[PDB]
């Protein structure tokens, strides 16, 4: 049995180490595999033999007694957002654990945290209020009201300015909806 | 070369219907598998396949058939399709010497329903960028909403001036339910585009935002008194404006 963290969070710039630990029985080697949303899954390593390997930005470690692996991932990109599996073969034949989605949280270089209101483009005075432009360790608060829905939080790139920001997007079906409430 | 491709992308099966996923590899791979993997969640070995004329049973065999007539193709079938069955469906492929890793394709996502009466197009909404956000950080955010889909069988795309754009777009990885607390409630997906003050300004400037759904064939039976929510792309679109 593959058992792997469902969720982990870093931020871009740093090292973060995922571990897997397997149950022996008929160990032929560990694998670990990156998937993207919702993409095909794509080889990283294969490891037999202890300890610990360089494959670029990644590495790769293996403890043949401690039934026990990690992945280390240094220099964190936001790419590198995925789920990643540890899987374990015994040579045809690969069983994988359950995954680990990692969020890479982007660096903020100068954050204004703000709440805007846009207006629908066609009608009927509907509208979204957006929270964008906080830094990454703010915690954007979910609906406890069952009218309003507030989405996660996402990191957009322009890349062609080299800025990054984090937004989430909340509206109602009901009007008048308060846009300064929601995320707070 | 190409790897290993699959089909179809996208099928929604009312419960007791048979379908078939195809799977194909030009890598001459002795090696090909079928797996299941539920949202997010991992993958689950159905059934696979050492060579031509053999097959064998994985982790969660019932109850699929398979087939491996030729080296290149594998065949997984569903004779009587049950809601359990509602998943994404990934191919794999191995050569036999002397390893090593497996070669995946893109999936099929499959949702079974009890009923097809469920099955919503979304309707797409364009949210024009806050003229506070313009002139405080001289970018602009352009919203985009996907709501009342279902199935979640959707792909969300931004196009400015009939070009396809990757570059300052968020989508949400994955909806919201916008009924919780119902099993088959239907989905809102939201898409931002950032865009500079000066880009948005422009009146020659158009912005759309894309929702494809997978939806009802011409094969399915529809009886409701509702447009039948066929395959179809929903779209919205801005204009740039000086004020």
């Known amino acids: 049995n593959i058992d792997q963290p469902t969720e982990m969070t870093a931020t871009e710039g740093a090292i973060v180490q995922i571990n897997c630990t397997y149950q022996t029985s008929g160990f032929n080697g560990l694998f670990w595999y990156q998937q993207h949303a919702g993409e095909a899954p794509t080889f990283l390593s294969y490891?037999?033999?202890?300890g610990l390997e360089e494959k670029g930005r990644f590495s790769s470690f293996l403890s043949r007694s401690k039934g026990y692996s990690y992945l280390l991932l240094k220099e964190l990109q936001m790419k590198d957002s995925a789920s990643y599996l540890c899987a374990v073969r015994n040579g045809f034949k690969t069983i994988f654990g359950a995954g680990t989605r990692l969020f890479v949280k982007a660096n903020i270089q100068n954050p204004d945290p703000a709440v805007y209101q846009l207006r629908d483009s066609k009608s009927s005075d509907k509208s979204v209020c957006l929270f964008t432009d906080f830094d990454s360790q703010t915690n954007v608060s979910q609906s406890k009201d069952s009218d309003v829905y507030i989405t996660d939080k996402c990191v957009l790139d322009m890349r062609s300015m080299d800025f990054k920001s984090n937004s989430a997007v909340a509206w109602s079906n009901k009007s008048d909806f308060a846009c300064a409430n929601a995320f707070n | 070369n190409a790897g290993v491709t699959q089909t179809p992308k996208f099928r929604v099966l009312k419960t007791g219907q048979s379908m078939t996923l195809l799977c194909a590899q030009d890598m001459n791979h002795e090696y090909m598998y079928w797996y299941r993997q539920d949202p997010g969640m991992g993958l689950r070995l159905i059934h696979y396949?050492?060579?031509?004329?053999?097959?064998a049973k994985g982790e969660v065999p019932d109850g699929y058939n398979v087939s491996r007539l030729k080296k290149q193709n594998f065949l997984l079938g569903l004779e009587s399709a049950a809601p359990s069955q509602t998943s994404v469906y990934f191919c794999?492929?191995?050569?036999?010497?002397?390893?090593?890793?497996?070669?995946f394709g893109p999936g099929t996502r499959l949702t079974v329903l009890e009923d097809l009466k469920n099955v919503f197009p979304p309707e797409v909404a364009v949210f024009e960028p806050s003229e506070a956000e313009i002139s405080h950080t001289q970018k602009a955010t352009l919203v985009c909403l996907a709501t009342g889909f279902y199935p979640d069988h959707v792909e969300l795309s931004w196009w400015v001036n009939g070009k396809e754009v990757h570059s300052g777009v968020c989508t949400d990885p994955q909806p919201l339910k916008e009924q919780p607390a119902l099993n088959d409630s239907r989905y809102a997906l939201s898409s931002r585009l950032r865009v500079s003050a000066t880009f948005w300004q422009n009146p020659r400037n158009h912005f759309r935002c894309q929702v494809q759904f997978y939806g009802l064939s011409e094969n399915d039976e529809w009886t409701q008194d509702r447009a039948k929510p066929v395959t179809q792309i929903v779209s919205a679109e801005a204009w740039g404006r000086a004020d």
């Open positions: 794999a492929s191995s050569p036999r010497l002397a390893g090593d890793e497996q070669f």
């Open positions: 490891n037999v033999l202890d």
């Open positions: 396949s050492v060579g031509e004329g053999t097959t």
